Paper text:
MtbTOP1 and topoisomerase I present in all bacterial pathogens are type IA topoisomerases that are needed for resolving topological barriers that require the passage of DNA through the break created on single-stranded DNA (ssDNA). M. tuberculosis topoisomerase I (MtbTOP1) is a validated target for much needed new antibiotics that can be used against the MDR-TB (multidrug-resistant tuberculosis) cases that are difficult to treat (1–3). D1–D4 form a toroidal assembly found in all topoisomerase IA while D5 represents the Topo_C_Rpt subgroup of bacterial topoisomerase C-terminal repeats.
One water molecule, W1, was assigned to coordinate the metal ion, forming a distorted octahedral geometry with one ligand missing. It should be mentioned that the position of the side chain of D111 is not well-defined in electron density maps, suggesting that this residue can adopt multiple positions, with one of the positions engaged in metal binding. Interestingly, the water W1 can form a hydrogen bond with another TOPRIM acidic residue, D113, proposed previously to interact with Mg2+. To evaluate any conformational change possibly induced by Mg2+ binding, two structures, MtbTOP1-704t/MTS2–11 and MtbTOP1-704t/MTS2-13/Mg were superimposed. The resulted small rmsd value of 0.69 Å from the alignment indicates no overall structural impact upon Mg2+ binding. A close examination of their active sites also found no major changes aside from the side chain of R344, which moved away >0.6 Å from Y342 and the scissile phosphate. Considering that the ssDNA is intact and that the distance between Y342 hydroxyl and the phosphorous of the scissile phosphate is 3.13 Å, we propose that this MtbTOP1-704t/MTS2-13/Mg structure may represent an enzyme-ssDNA complex following DNA religation in the presence of Mg2+, as further elaborated later. The position of E24 in the MtbTOP1-704t/MTS2-13/Mg structure also supports the assignment of this structure as the likely structure following DNA religation.
Numbering used by the authors: 16 to 387, 389 to 704
Write the structure that this text describes.
DNA sequence: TTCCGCTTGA
């Protein structure tokens, strides 16, 4: 009848689509992109190597015409499709329905060059009605989307291949700089600077255990603990009252109790009774966690299962290829009605009708009205039991089930009832001899666990906090009730520097800033580690001195290229290209040469990217760029770190026999993190 | 020397 060729991007869809379609339909896969810009000069065809832009791959002097070549990894895949194209009646371009997927269909047109009719439709749901809906109602190739994808491609190409040579002439060779990797490095570097410029401050208070069984034996719990809050109408300072330099923020508003000060208030207080001023309770209701997307999956697998980004997505790949979970590269949290009414079934069989939500639970996001797959959840209409997945997946690599259980529990919890409870706020007054003291304590009750019986989020390893199912019981006291002082213990504390970035906390920061995509979060963690900018200290992402010099040079003379707002603002200028108003050539002309467009501080206002690199390969001294300013010594001589041929080395200008300037230097290895390089540690390795 | 995004086997 009619041999029709359907091309998707995933082989898992191929065998799946070939079942709902049947005979006559040939379903093959491209495995992503087939064409890309030449990665190096060796990939440029011979007739273009002499052209003065073969290093870029884009003809920036002729309306930004790229040089698309077949990527050698996808070379054999192209030959298979060209042969299948010779013996078919029509060609169906059924790639994804996003910006990158639409360009692949256009790349398939330019590469295959068919003479048969071509239809462009998108398959979201994999069902017989959804297959018959998009196929019977085709569509045209969105050229505005392809021009937007090209504009994103050429942008990242001009960014990376023009700014990286700046690092080669100012820092070290073979270094890289990108719209994503340089900003991710800039985040980890900025956090380390916060820990380096952090001055701790000590503060004290009183921890008092109390008793209420005297005035009310029928009380539960009979005892509880409280802390000191106010002394003589003046707040007791805690962590939130000190800034990054140890000074006070509230100014003349709080007290700073010391050891002798607190032990005196605890001394002249025991033996007396405390009076309950107020005890106001308040109800609350926690909504269930949304289903797993790519970011939240990597976060929870890092906090609970201690998996890395590559370890998580490698397991999710095998789980998807074997038909256990859906597509793991997604930015959506939506569920199909088959998955909703199935998670409500498994939850009811496991926790009864008491914990199942009485209302349909759906958690939607945004992108472009209807341009945005679904969440990561167990595939099929009937969820495979985690017991059967535990059997079918044996071997020492049991991680395939431990990650599957998380997806099976998280999805079930999304369709369960809320968590009902109450929280207290006790204000306890007293008299410490001649001064008025105020004690305060708070607790949280979990009357109805709900979805917390199936899945509970894990706290961060470094940030630290309270679990969402942790209870803090307190007795119900009456205003005016008298409490006995069981124990008084003045404890001392100190403010701690900001926490390092984990692989989970960094991905959470990238997704919130709009940087990187679900299919790139793992590659970002790998890239900044392979380029030599970030290394792991157990679970913390620690920067390097090369990362300080690269980020420092970038944030000085290429400030907008490393701004967190850049990718978000570039995405807004890209969404207009995909809808009209602006053109592909006009926007690239402003970004590379200059124009009236963008935010006030954008690159088009600064004279384009070409002129921005020209004034930096001319009016920049690498000796000042390789100067990571640390601090001054006891004599006021500045100490800075320089990055050389041998490696990162410490340096300051000291006096010698004839005086100054004698550069005294030392060596630095990655065993001393930047926050651990104080003036004492610096003076140690300076001597010997 | 170098980019970001798409997706699997070399
Ligand atoms: Mg795709
Ligand atoms: Mg305390
Ligand atoms: Mg209560
Ligand atoms: Mg615009």
């Amino acid at each position: 009848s009619g041999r029709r060729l359907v091309i998707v991007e995933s082989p898992t869809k191929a065998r799946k689509l070939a079942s709902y379609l049947g005979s006559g339909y040939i379903v093959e896969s491209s495995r992503g992109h087939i064409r890309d810009l030449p990665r190096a000069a060796s990939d440029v065809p011979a007739k273009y190597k002499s052209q003065p832009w073969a290093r870029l791959g884009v003809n920036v002097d002729a309306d930004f015409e790229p040089l698309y070549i077949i990527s050698p990894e996808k070379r054999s895949t192209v030959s298979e499709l060209r042969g299948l194209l010779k013996d078919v009646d029509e060609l169906y371009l059924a790639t994804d329905g996003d910006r990158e997927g639409e360009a692949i269909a256009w790349h398939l047109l330019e590469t295959l060059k068919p003479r048969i009719p071509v239809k462009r439709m998108v398959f979201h749901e994999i069902t017989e009605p959804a297959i018959r809906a998009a196929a019977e109602h085709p569509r045209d190739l969105d050229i505005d989307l392809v021009d937007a994808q090209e504009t994103r491609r050429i942008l990242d190409r001009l960014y990376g291949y023009e700014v990286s040579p700046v690092l080669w002439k100012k820092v070290a060779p073979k270094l890289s700089a990108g719209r994503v990797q340089s900003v991710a490095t800039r985040i980890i570097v900025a956090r380390e600077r916060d820990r380096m410029a952090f001055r701790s401050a000590a503060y004290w208070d009183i921890l008092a255990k109390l008793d209420a069984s005297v005035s009310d034996p029928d009380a539960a719990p009979p005892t509880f603990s409280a802390r000191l809050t106010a002394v003589a109408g003046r707040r007791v300072a805690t962590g939130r009252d000190f800034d990054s330099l140890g000074t006070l923020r509230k100014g003349d508003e709080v007290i700073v109790l010391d050891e002798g000060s607190a032990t005196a208030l605890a001394a002249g207080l025991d033996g007396t009774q405390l009076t309950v001023a107020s005890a106001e309770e308040k109800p609350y209701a926690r909504r269930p966690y949304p289903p797993f997307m790519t970011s939240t999956l990597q976060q929870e697998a890092s906090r609970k299962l201690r998996f890395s980004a590559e370890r998580t997505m490698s397991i999710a790949q095998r789980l998807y290829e074997n038909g256990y979970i859906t597509y793991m590269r997604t930015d959506s949290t939506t569920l199909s009605e088959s998955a909703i009414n199935a998670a409500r079934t498994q939850a009811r069989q496991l926790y009864g009708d008491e914990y199942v939500a009485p209302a349909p639970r759906q958690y939607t996001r945004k992108v472009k009205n209807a341009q945005e797959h679904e969440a990561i959840r167990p595939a099929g209409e009937t969820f495979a039991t985690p017991d059967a997945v535990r059997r079918e997946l044996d071997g020492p690599n049991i991680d395939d089930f431990r990650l599957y259980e998380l997806i099976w529990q998280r999805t079930v919890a999304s369709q369960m009832a809320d968590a009902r409870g109450m929280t207290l706020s006790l204000r306890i007054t007293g008299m410490s001899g001649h001064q008025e003291v105020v004690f305060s304590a708070t607790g949280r009750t979990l009357t109805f666990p709900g979805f917390l019986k199936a899945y509970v989020e894990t706290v961060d390893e470094l940030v630290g906090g309270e679990a969402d199912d942790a209870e803090r019981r307190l007795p119900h006291l009456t205003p005016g009730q008298r409490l006995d002082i069981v124990e008084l213990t003045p404890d001392g504390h100190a403010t701690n520097p900001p926490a390092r970035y984990t692989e989970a906390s960094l991905v959470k920061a990238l997704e919130e800033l709009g940087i990187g995509r679900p299919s790139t979060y793992s590659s970002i963690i790998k890239t900044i580690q392979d380029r030599g900018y970030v290394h792991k200290k157990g679970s913390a992402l620690v920067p390097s001195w090369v990362a300080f010099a690269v980020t420092g040079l970038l944030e000085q003379h290429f400030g907008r290229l490393v701004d967190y707002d850049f990718t978000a603002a570039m995405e807004d200028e890209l969404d207009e290209i995909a809808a009209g108003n602006e053109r592909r050539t006009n926007w690239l002309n402003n970004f590379y040469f200059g124009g009236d467009h963008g935010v006030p501080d954008s690159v088009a206002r600064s004279g384009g990217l070409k002129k921005l690199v020209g004034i930096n390969l001319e009016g920049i001294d690498a000796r000042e760029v390789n100067s990571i300013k640390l601090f001054d010594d006891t004599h006021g001589r500045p100490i800075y770190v320089r990055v050389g041929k041998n490696g990162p080395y410490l340096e300051r200008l000291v006096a010698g026999d004839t005086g100054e300037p004698t550069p005294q230097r030392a060596n630095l290895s990655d065993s001393i993190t930047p926050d651990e390089l104080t003036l004492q540690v610096a003076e140690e390795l300076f001597a010997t």
